[PDB]
């Protein structure tokens, strides 16, 4: 589930949208 | 609908500066010791209507004490002030409290540690416990940065009125008038001095 | 079945709003004295279309400035600040009866001060047109 | 000038005119009130007003006027009692005793003028402190006798005894001499047997609650000092813990009494004491459950409603429970019949801990800390409190405050860490549950998600690494899902910040998962371009926070990477920080400096430093060439700002690299000092062309910022330097040439106090290596700075503080610099030290006293040589009398301890024959007179003139004791305190100074 985490964390929008 | 408030504490703790801030918004940097007592009406606007405090700002220096505990007669609330940069002013809080409750046996009292804006705090938060057994409300405050500067009056207002949901509200703002050469040269003169007198505390954020 | 169950700013528009520190000049002591810190607002009355300055102190919300943005007022800089404006006021009613004051208003940055002057002059044109 | 009639003592005092002034002051307002105030102060402060006090108390109808009369009388009893003819002493006692008797008879007066009666009681107690029992042996017997005659007298006698106990045991330390305090304490101890009988009889028989409450209020004071047998060898605990807990009149005071009982000194090995300690706790909790509220009650809601005295009662209940359980809970943990009582008491505390009241929460939180710490170390205890600790976990988690409050967060974290060790599984379940209710929206709010994130972050390091891995992953996944769920920048910003807060709190997790750590850092870089308020500050603060703990993983070449990540950061640094404010860029560079310092290969560390500083060094090189060409270019605000930001960047990197920063400092050092001189000239020129007001202009303030940041950079490196040879040989020479003359030759308003601060650091670390440099520092800053600050205590506060810090370090590290001063300048050095004594500003006062102390030590180390001999002849008695002055003037109480230490040192020198030469002039006293005799003679004369109301016998005894005790600081200080009491009155007992035998 570690690769899942970085995947989902990367999707965190830097522009908040 | 007015309540007598006595304000006591050692000299130099900021009692008069605290009141002045509430009366005019000014921050006085000079220490001009109070002589005896100075009475100042102070009005706050609440959702329960206006409440007036008659603040008896007393002197903390013994040689200027005047009537001392004679100022406490018939007080309905009080603030005890000390200076978190001066351990001795906290050491004397029990003495101020003693002389106060011998005259006023059952009034709401706020304990205020002033000058928390200064980095080199000497009376640490964990050392301040005197209020617990005496049932005083305590607040860290700063008359300079306005930190919690309204809390003492809000808490007392709620106690004196008997309404814990009382809140400060915005006083009504009447429409101002849309308003002479005979006075022109006197403003252009006063304005010339004002421009050439530097605003204080220019390093301050705002 | 029927079960019975158990500020004088409303008529105005906010043109401009900025946080500022307001000073008044005490000519007797030749020093500036703070009068309040909080939101300074340009309020346009909907029935008259004329604009005023309304500024309240934080927490207590007490009024520390209330006066029309007269067309004759003039913003001058202060010698020790690039983010402040000085100007005389002939009738401010924050403390009761109208009274004359020499005000100084300071902001967080030079741009907010420049923007203030921009809006301050726009508002003057409006009070001119009426 | 109408109300001013009473101030004329030629004519008889017109009572009616007095009551007008008094009424105008208390009930009036405005100018008339203010004028009445001044008249009353002047009347009260008349040294004869006490004589007219008998008139007021008899013939005035205004209780305020009688109160004022007793205040005037109080000043007299306190300060001049022993100076009066014995006739007046007996008279004053008589009409105070009589006045109190009469007021207690008129039930109308006894109920209407409680203030006036309490003031008269206190005035009576002052007389007792002067006269009792040596001149009043029958007071207590006659008090007990009079009590039986009238309930009103009996009640007031309880008030008199309360005040007496307070004045003798609670507030005597600094108001009496040690001997007089002991005398009164012993006197009350002797006659307490009968005082207690009266008190216990009233409590067992009396009916009127006003008398009961007054007796219980006096009992509260007695418990501060009385022997424990009066409480445990009687039935009084039974009365307190049952009878008096039922009525709300007596409940408040009874609860306070039992709180103090829980603090009594008790045997600890008697098993019947333990029974009685258990018994009164059992009775008290029973009365609360039946008469006040059950343990299920919602005290949070009760406290918020604030009915009557509920708030004070719940506060006192918290104090009672925490006090008793902190000391006695072991008594309840072994007996199975006491288990319900133990857990009900703690359940009340659970309910109390939910009240929204910061200071009350801190009181209960302190107890919880006391408990969970004991359950962490004490065997076989934690199982007892499983259900209590489970509830406590939720209470702490839901009331977690922001970490940046700071003290309350640390206290909350400490308790919650303990609670996590005690049952990690239950803690994990609570937090996941709370998070699920944030996702389903049932408890969602900005405040609630922040509180939960702080709680989750506060327990890092308590779980096993494997459990933590699984827990952390679950939390981040959930939080990421919560962010996607929400819409709008504001909501997504709150959750994003909380995500980043949590990851920053789990560096062990980050250090084990590089791939993830890389993703976090790169995501923070993305947030550094987002302008939404708070995001950029959050991104930068998380960056440096992570770096501080994971730096090692940025400097190494991680497997499956082509280079250490630090190199990647420095490459895109322009792009990464392009949207940040200057202060945020500086934090970023500082964070990089943290990483670079982890590289201990010198050649690689210096290369990383060069690459990091590339942009500021290029900007620097450019403006250095432009600056030297067109010095007027520094009048451009933009150029000044660019320069200041370059220097601030060097300060930031230097702050985190310390000694490793030296190569970058060498790159800019010489041109930086040239710049320092160039901006210095411009400041001086602006002040010449526009006046001192120029120092307030933004132009000049920008220029002084450059100078101040240069000094800060140099100070920062030297304070952390390892190679002090290079500091001396390379840095100091140019620095002093650049700063000293500029400081000396600017007008006071243009001198930067930071120069003094920077010099203090130079002396601190290399002072012992540059004696000629220290001399140069004194010459350039000593006299001109002293002249700035020796006219008042207000002007130039920064220069004031740094001035005495600088003198302090020079006096410690390069005392020889003061020996080279010409005698006139050394005299100013002494004048400056004493000048520091007189400051109330702690920063100045403390250093002034320490300099004086270290200066005496420095002179003592020199031995019997001319300079030391000449120093004592010139300045010994100056330091003795200046120390005595601030010690006795009542305006420098904050420095008593250091004043006492300095005085003890001065006196010890003479009575150890460390001063080889006579301190007197040979014509002043017969030859052969020892310095001991002369010192005692000088001090006697000094105190006789400074305090002429003291008898020669007082002075002589005080000095004989102070001299004999100059090796025992604690006793020495006691004798000084006793002297400070005696100078406030007349007729102090000289034998008091024998208190220490
Ligand atoms: N830094 C800081 N200084 C303060 C603050 N409040 C007051 N001061 C300063 O403390 C000094 C004493 O102020 P003051 O109000 O006169 O104290 P006081 O208690 O009225 N003295 P007295 O009892 O003799 O009348 C002043 O110089 C004031 O500017 C504060 O909140 N922060
Ligand atoms: Mg004052």
Author numbering:
A (entry chain D): 56 to 72
B (entry chain A): 9 to 187, 190 to 216
C (entry chain B): 63 to 68, 78 to 201
D (entry chain C): -1 to 376, 414 to 439, 461 to 1053
Question: Which lines from the publication concern this structure?
Answer:
The chromosome region maintenance 1 protein (CRM1) or Exportin-1 (XPO1) binds 8–15 residues-long nuclear export signals (NESs) in hundreds of different protein cargoes. NES sequences are very diverse but each usually has 4–5 hydrophobic residues (often Leu/Val/Ile/Phe/Met; labeled Ф0–5) that bind hydrophobic pockets (labeled P0–P4) in a hydrophobic groove formed by HEAT repeats 11 and 12 of CRM1 (9–16). All NESs also participate in hydrogen bonding with Lys568 of HsCRM1, and mutagenic/structural analysis identifies Lys568 as a selectivity filter that blocks binding of non-NES peptides.
We study three NESs that uniquely match the all-helical class 3 pattern (Ф1XXФ2XXXФ3XXФ4). A third class 3-matching NES from beta-amyloid binding protein X11L2 (X11L2NES: 55SSLQELVQQFEALPGDLV72) binds differently. 57LQELVQQFEAL67 forms a 3-turn α-helix, 68PGDL71 forms a type I β-turn, and X11L2NES therefore exhibits a new Φ0XXΦ1XXXΦ2XXΦ3XXXΦ4 (class 4) pattern. The only common secondary structural element in the NES structures is one turn of NES helix at Φ2X2-3Φ3 (grey box). This conserved turn of helix is flanked on one side by additional turns of helix (classes 1, 1-R) or by loops (class 2), and on the other side by β-strands (classes 1, 1-R, 2) or β-turn (class 4), or the helix ends as the chain terminates or exits the groove (class 3). Because most previously studied NESs have substantial helical content, we also study five NESs that match class 2 (Ф1XФ2XXФ3XФ4) and class 1b (Ф1XXФ2XXФ3XФ4) patterns, where the hydrophobic residue positions do not suggest an amphipathic helix. All eight NESs bind HsCRM1 in the presence of RanGTP with dissociation constants (KDs) of 670 nM-20 μM, and were crystallized bound to the previously described engineered ScCRM1-RanGppNHp-Yrb1p complex.
